[PDB]
Amino acid sequence: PPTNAERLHEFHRAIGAATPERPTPPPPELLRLRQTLLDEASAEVRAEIDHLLARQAAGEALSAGDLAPLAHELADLLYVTYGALDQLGIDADAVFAEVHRANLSKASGPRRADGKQLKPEGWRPADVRGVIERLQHA
Amino acid sequence: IDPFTMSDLPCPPTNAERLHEFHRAIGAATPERPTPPPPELLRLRQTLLDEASAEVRAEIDHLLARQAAGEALSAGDLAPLAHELADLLYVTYGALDQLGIDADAVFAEVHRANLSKASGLKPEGWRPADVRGVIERLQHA
Ligand SMILES: O=c1ccn([C@H]2C[C@H](O)[C@@H](COP(=O)(O)O)O2)c(=O)[nH]1
Numbered sequence: 236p237p238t239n240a241e242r243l244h245e246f247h248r249a250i251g252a253a254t255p256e257r258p259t260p261p262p263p264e265l266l267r268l269r270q271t272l273l274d275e276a277s278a279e280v281r282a283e284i285d286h287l288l289a290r291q292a293a294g295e296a297l298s299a300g301d302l303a304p305l306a307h308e309l310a311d312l313l314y315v316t317y318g319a320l321d322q323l324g325i326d327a328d329a330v331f332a333e334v335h336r337a338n339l340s341k342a343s344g345p346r347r348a349d350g351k352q353l354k355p356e357g358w359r360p361a362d363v364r365g366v367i368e369r370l371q372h373a
Numbered sequence: 374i375d376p377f378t379m380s381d382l383p384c385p386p387t388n389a390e391r392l393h394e395f396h397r398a399i400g401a402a403t404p405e406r407p408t409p410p411p412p413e414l415l416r417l418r419q420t421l422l423d424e425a426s427a428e429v430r431a432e433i434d435h436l437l438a439r440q441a442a443g444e445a446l447s448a449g450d451l452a453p454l455a456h457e458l459a460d461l462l463y464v465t466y467g468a469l470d471q472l473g474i475d476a477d478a479v480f481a482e483v484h485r486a487n488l489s490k491a492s493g494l495k496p497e498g499w500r501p502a503d504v505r506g507v508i509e510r511l512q513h514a
Pocket residue numbers: 334338350351352353354421459460461463464467
């Protein structure tokens with residue numbers, strides 16, 4: 236069963252712009268393009284969250300159906316974020332698994348006042364350099 | 374499984390299912406089905422999305438500066454950017470998970486529309502992504 240990362244690979248092949256299979260340093264125009272796509276998708280999510288917060292400040296009780304535009308824009312952001320990893324030739328699932336393992340290890344840490352999970356004493360970061368080296372050879 | 378099961382090798386978890394595991398582990402809200410959020414949850418999700426976006430941008434800028442000055446970039450030089458892009462995935466999935474919205478279901482519908490459009494400009498009979506229908510269907514699962 237395909238992953239969302241593999242879906243992006245299929246999409247790029249379908250638009251005739253097949254992407255490398257292994258990590259590949261990109262030309263500058265590729266980085267600038269991916270940055271623009273990330274910024275526009277981030278701005279759409281940001282605007283929608285501000286929009287929902289303003290409705291709540293007005294006293295409206297949101298329903299689940301009110302969440303459809305935000306869910307759509309969040310998925311569009313996933314699309315362009317996976318898309319950036321795919322055009323770099325970087326297996327997003329392998330990097331994500333490393334990041335996830337180093338996030339589960341934060342469970343014993345304290346929380347910030349806004350709810351952000353913080354790092355416990357002694358915590359050590361994900362080793363994404365090692366994942367990249369793993370993907371680069373085989 | 375039952376006494377007849379002689380092997381059990383499940384499909385690996387999706388990245389969306391990983392966010393559910395993380396939020397369970399840290400005691401954060403992770404509803405099974407779509408759930409309107411308190412404003413405090415929306416504010417946190419915004420903060421994490423802004424923070425992760427800023428970190429990605431910082432790493433893209435570092436790469437552009439190094440290659441501008443002639444540096445030969447190896448695959449290993451992409452590791453900070455890849456880490457920050459994975460963090461951005463993480464908090465984007467994380468917002469969908471805290472809303473009780475199956476990110477894989479929503480992504481699959483966005484992908485269906487995007488992949489369909491690539492076979493056309495739109496092909497005949499093209500249907501845009503119907504995320505509203507996905508959330509309704511998730512409510513009745
Ligand atoms: O409340 C939290 C705190 C951290 N993270 C994940 C997202 C990133 O992968 C990474 C960011 O953590 P910091 O490095 O900013 O502390 O942890 C969350 O998803 N929710």
